[PDB]
Amino acid sequence: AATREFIEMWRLLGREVPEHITEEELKTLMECVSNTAKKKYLKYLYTKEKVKKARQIKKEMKAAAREEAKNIKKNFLFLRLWDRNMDIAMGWKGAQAMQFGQPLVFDMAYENYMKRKELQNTVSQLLESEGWNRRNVDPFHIYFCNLKIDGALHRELVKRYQEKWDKLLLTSTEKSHVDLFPKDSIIYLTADSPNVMTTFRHDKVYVIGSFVDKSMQPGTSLAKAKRLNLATECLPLDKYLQWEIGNKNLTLDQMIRILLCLKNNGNWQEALQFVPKRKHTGFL
C-alpha cells in the first residue's frame, strides 16, 4: 500500500516517528482520515518503541548485573510456593463469591460510542478492576453484562486474559442486567445522576458503565439508565472532597476500590482515598 511509502517521507522530516511499523499498524494508519490524527498515532508508536528500548536496555543491564552477582556468590516449615498458594486461595474465595457474593455489574453496551483507543483502555481498566476484586477479603460476584460474544470488547478481553478467560471466576453473558436481576434492586452508578449515594446498600446490585469516554459524551450512562427505568446514583464527591481540577467521572478500577471498601464497612473517607489526589485538596 502507499502508506508504507507514505511514512517514508514523514521519517525524513523527523515528525517523531518510530523505526518500524508492523503490518497490523499499517492497517490502522489507513483508518486515520486526517494529517493531525496520523500525527497523534505516530507519536504513540514513537513513545511505545522508546519505552520498549529503554526497558530492554535496563533489562539486559540488570541481567548483566545479576550474572556477575552469581559469580561473586536449615529448618524451614514451608517451601516457598507463596505466589502459587495465594492464587489458589483467591480461587477458593472467588468460587465462594460466585455462589453467595454480592453482584456487581459491568455494562458492556458502550462499544458503539468508543473508538479503538478508548476500547483498549476499558479492557486495561477491567483487568485492574477484577484484580482488586480477586485480591479482596470479600469479593463482589462480578457480572459482565451486554458482552457480545464476537464483539471488539470481548475479543480484546480474550487477548489480554488468554486461557485465563475461561477460568475467570466471573459471569459473562450477552444478556442485560435487567434480565438477570429484579429491576428494583438495580442501582445504576453515574456522575450525572441527580441522586447522591448516601450509604452503601448490601441488598442492591450496582451497575458500572464500562465506558472510557476521553472524547466526552455526557449523560450516556444516565440515558441508558432512563430508557430502562433504573435508579441512578452519583458518588458524594462534592460533599466530602474539595474539588479543584479534573473530571468527576472516575476510572473503573477506582470505582470498584471505592465500592469494595464501602462494602467492607468503611466510611466515605476511607473510600474516597482512592479518588485521584490531583483532583482535590483534602476532605471537608
Partner: protein
C-alpha cells in the same frame, strides 16, 4: 511571518432582518465590518467571540451600520477588552458622545475612532485602507470603502531541498539560520553564498479584498471613477481576491457597476450582501418556535422565512478562505429543517404526552392582540431578545411598548412580507426609561416605517413617541451630528401623560389628543415606577373598556398598583428569581413572586411576566403560585384575551419541552444555596 489562516465569514447576509456584517478572522487579529442591530446576537449565537475584536470598520454613518455599535461596546466592555478602534466616517466621534447620553460614562474600555482622514492601520495580519466616497448631487454623502491588504508571508522552509544539495538538515542546530532561510537572506552554507529563495517556498505577494458599500444609485458613478480603486483594477502585480458588495439589487444591475466589477480580474470573486438572500440567521429562535408551535399553533405562530459578473449570493456563516488556500467554504452554512426540530421535540421524555393531553383537555374579542417581540433584559441571547411588546388595538392600529436593538428584526421575522402593513399600522411607541435596551431599536423602526409608508403609498407623518425627556437629547444629538431622524418623531414627554400633570404647551396637548384619537384609547396614563429614576409605566384604556398595563423595568410600585386597578392584563417583569431578593433591591428589579403580588393587588384578570434575565432565559422558573392568572412570555408569543384560560394549561407542555433547562436552573439554585452554606 504573518497569519497563516485568514478567512472572511458572513455574520449577516444582508436580509432586511439583519442587514450586512462581515467578520474577518486571523490567527492574531479579529475584525468586524459594520455593526448593525443584532450583530451582537448573531455572533454570540454562532460562537464568534467578540472579546477578541481589534477594529470595527463601518462603511457608512447610518443606523443600519451603527445600530448595534452602542450594543457591543457595553458588552465587550464587560468581557474586559481594554481598547477598541472604530474605523470609518469622522462623525463616529460625535456618535460615541451621543451614545454616552444614556449608556453611562463608558469607562473601563478605550474607544479610539480612526477616521478615513487618518493614516493606514497596520497590523500583524493586514494594512487597511479607507477610501472616502462622496455621492453625486453631518454628511449623508459619505461612504467608506475598505481595501485590506494582507502582509507578505515568508516562504515555508524546504528541509528536503536543503539536504538535496547537501546542506545539513539540523532541525534544531541550523534553526537560527532557518530563520534567515525564512527571511530569504543568502546562506553561507554549502561552501557558497546560496540565496534562501530557492530553499524556501515562493512567498505569496499577499491577497487584498475590498469591502465596498453602494447604498443606492448616487454612489455608483463616484465608485466607478475612483482613483484609488483603479490602482487595484487591472494592475498585474496587485490582484484583488474578493470584493464584498453591500449594494442592493438595483445598484448591481446597473451597467456602470457591472463594468466596474468586471474591471477587477476575472479571477476575483465577488460577494453580494443584500435583501435577495433572505436566509435564516437566528436558528435557535426558529427551532424553539417550531417546537412551541406544536403546543399551540395560535399562541406560538411560525416564523416567516424564504448577471454579467459571476456573483456569490451572501449566506449566513459563508466563508471565504484567503490562507492557506483561496476557496469558498460552505461547511458552517446555517441549515434549518423544521421537520428535524419537530422530530427532536417529539422524542423528548414527556413532551408528546403533555401536548397530546393538552388537546384532549381543549376538546372575548379577537382584538387586542399582545405580541411579545422580545422578553429578555440587557444582553440579547439566542432565545430571548431585549424588550418589545406590540399591542394591536385593531386591524389598522398598533402600539409598541418599548423597542430595543433587535426589535425591528423580531417584527420582520414575525410578520415577513406583512411587516409593511404592520409598520404603517403603528401609531405610538412607549419607552419606559433610558436603559439602552428600551430605546436603542427606535431608530430602526423610524427608518423602516418610512420605507413601509412609501411602499403602501401612505403619506409620511411623524411617529408619536412617549418617552422621557432624556431621549430627546440623545436623538437631538444623533440628528445634529450623525443622521436625520427627528422629522420622524412627535415626542410626548412621559411626564405629560401622568395623572394630575400640569397642562404642557398647546403643541404637546394637541399631540396627546392625537395619541388618544389614533390609538382609539380613552386614557393613556403614565406613572413613575421605581427604577433608577425617570422610569415610567403606562396604562392603556380602550374605548371598549379593557385596560392593559405595562410596568417596564421596576420594583413593587404602589403608584403602578393604584394606576392599573382592575386591569384586564398586566405586563410585569420578573428579571430576578425568588430568593434573589437582595439582588432585586440593588438592581431595582422584581422577582417572580413580587411581580405576581403586584398583579394581585391590582386585581388584574391576568398577569404576564417579561424582562427575564439570561440567568433564567430558556425557561423562567415557574413558581407554584397562582397558576390560573399568571403567564410567561416567549419571543413571538401572541396573547389575546381569549387565550387567558389556555395559558394555565400550556405550563405542563412548556415544562416538558424545557425540562432540560429547568434541571440546570434548579441546580444553580441548589448550588447557590450550597455556596451560601459554604
Amino acid at each position: 511571518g504573518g497569519p497563516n489562516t485568514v478567512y472572511l465569514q458572513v455574520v449577516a447576509a444582508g436580509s432586511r432582518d439583519s442587514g450586512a456584517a462581515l467578520y474577518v478572522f486571523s490567527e492574531f487579529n479579529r475584525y468586524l465590518f459594520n455593526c448593525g442591530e443584532g450583530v451582537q446576537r448573531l455572533m454570540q449565537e454562532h460562537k464568534l467571540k467578540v472579546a477578541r475584536l481589534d477594529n470595527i470598520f463601518l462603511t457608512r454613518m447610518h443606523w443600519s451600520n451603527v445600530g448595534g455599535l452602542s450594543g457591543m461596546i457595553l458588552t465587550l466592555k464587560e468581557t474586559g477588552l481594554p481598547k477598541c478602534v472604530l474605523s470609518g466616517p469622522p462623525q463616529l466621534e460625535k456618535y460615541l458622545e451621543a451614545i454616552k447620553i444614556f449608556s453611562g460614562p463608558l469607562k473601563g474600555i478605550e474607544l479610539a475612532v480612526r477616521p478615513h482622514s487618518a493614516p493606514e492601520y497596520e497590523d500583524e495580519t493586514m494594512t487597511v485602507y479607507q477610501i472616502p466616497i462622496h455621492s453625486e448631487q453631518r454628511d449623508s454623502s459619505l461612504v467608506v470603502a475598505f481595501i485590506c491588504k494582507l502582509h507578505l508571508k515568508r516562504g515555508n522552509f524546504l528541509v528536503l531541498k536543503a539536504k538535496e544539495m547537501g546542506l545539513p538538515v539540523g532541525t534544531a542546530a541550523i534553526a537560527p539560520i532557518i530563520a534567515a532561510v525564512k527571511d530569504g537572506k543568502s546562506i553561507t552554507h554549502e561552501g557558497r553564498e546560496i540565496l534562501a529563495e530557492e530553499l524556501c517556498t515562493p512567498p505569496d505577494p499577499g491577497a487584498a479584498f475590498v469591502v465596498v458599500e453602494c447604498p443606492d444609485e448616487s454612489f455608483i458613478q463616484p465608485i466607478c471613477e475612483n482613483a484609488t480603486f483603479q490602482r487595484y483594477q487591472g494592475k498585474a502585480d496587485a490582484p484583488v481576491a474578493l470584493v464584498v458588495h453591500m449594494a442592493p439589487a438595483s445598484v448591481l444591475v446597473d451597467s456602470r457597476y457591472q463594468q466596474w466589477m468586471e474591471r477587477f480580474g476575472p479571477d476575483t470573486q465577488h460577494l453580494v450582501l443584500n435583501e435577495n438572500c433572505a436566509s435564516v440567521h437566528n436558528l435557535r429562535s426558529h427551532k424553539i418556535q417550531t417546537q412551541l408551535n406544536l403546543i399551540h399553533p395560535d399562541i406560538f405562530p411560525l416564523l416567516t422565512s424564504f448577471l454579467s459578473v459571476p456573483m456569490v449570493q451572501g449566506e449566513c456563516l459563508l466563508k471565504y478562505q484567503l490562507r492557506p488556500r483561496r476557496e469558498w467554504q460552505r461547511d458552517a452554512i446555517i441549515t434549518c429543517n423544521p421537520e428535524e426540530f419537530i422530530v427532536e421535540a417529539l422524542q423528548l421524555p414527556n413532551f408528546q404526552q403533555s401536548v397530546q393531553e393538552y388537546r384532549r383537555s381543549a376538546q372575548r374579542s379577537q382584538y387586542p392582540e399582545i405580541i411579545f417581540l422580545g422578553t429578555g433584559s440587557a444582553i440579547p441571547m439566542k432565545i430571548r431578545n431585549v424588550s418589545a411588546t406590540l399591542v394591536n388595538i385593531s386591524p389598522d392600529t398598533s402600539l409598541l411598548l418599548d423597542c430595543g436593538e433587535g426589535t425591528f428584526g423580531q417584527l420582520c421575522r414575525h410578520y415577513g412580507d406583512q411587516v409593511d402593513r404592520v409598520l404603517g399600522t403603528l401609531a405610538a411607541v412607549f419607552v419606559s426609561h433610558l436603559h439602552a435596551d428600551h430605546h436603542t431599536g427606535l431608530p430602526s423602526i423610524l427608518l423602516q416605517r418610512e420605507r413601509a409608508l412609501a411602499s403602501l403609498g401612505k403619506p409620511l407623518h411623524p411617529l408619536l413617541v412617549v418617552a422621557p425627556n432624556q431621549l430627546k437629547a440623545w436623538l437631538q444629538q444623533y440628528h445634529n451630528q450623525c443622521q436625520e431622524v427627528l422629522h420622524h418623531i412627535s415626542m410626548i414627554p412621559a411626564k405629560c401623560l401622568q395623572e394630575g400633570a400640569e397642562i404642557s404647551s398647546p403643541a404637546v396637548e394637541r399631540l396627546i389628543s392625537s395619541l388618544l384619537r389614533t390609538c382609539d384609547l380613552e386614557e393613556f396614563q403614565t406613572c413613575l415606577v421605581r427604577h433608577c429614576k425617570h422610569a415610567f409605566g403606562c396604562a392603556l384604556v380602550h374605548t371598549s373598556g379593557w385596560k392593559v398595563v405595562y410596568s417596564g423595568d421596576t420594583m413593587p410600585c404602589e403608584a403602578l398598583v393604584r394606576m392599573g386597578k382592575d386591569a384586564t392584563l398586566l405586563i410585569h417583569e420578573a428579571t430576578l428569581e425568588d430568593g434573589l431578593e437582595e439582588e432585586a433591591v440593588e438592581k431595582t428589579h422584581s422577582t417572580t413572586s413580587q411581580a405576581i403580588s403586584v398583579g394581585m393587588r391590582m386585581n388584574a384578570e391576568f398577569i404576564m411576566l417579561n424582562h427575564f434575565s439570561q440567568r433564567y432565559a430558556k425557561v423562567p422558573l415557574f413558581s407554584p403560585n397562582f397558576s390560573e392568572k399568571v403567564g410567561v412570555a416567549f419571543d413571538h408569543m401572541k396573547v389575546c384575551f381569549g387565550d387567558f384560560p389556555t395559558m394555565p394549561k400550556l405550563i405542563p407542555p412548556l415544562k416538558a419541552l424545557f425540562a432540560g433547562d429547568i434541571e440546570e436552573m434548579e441546580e444553580r439554585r441548589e448550588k447557590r444555596e450550597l455556596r451560601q452554606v459554604r
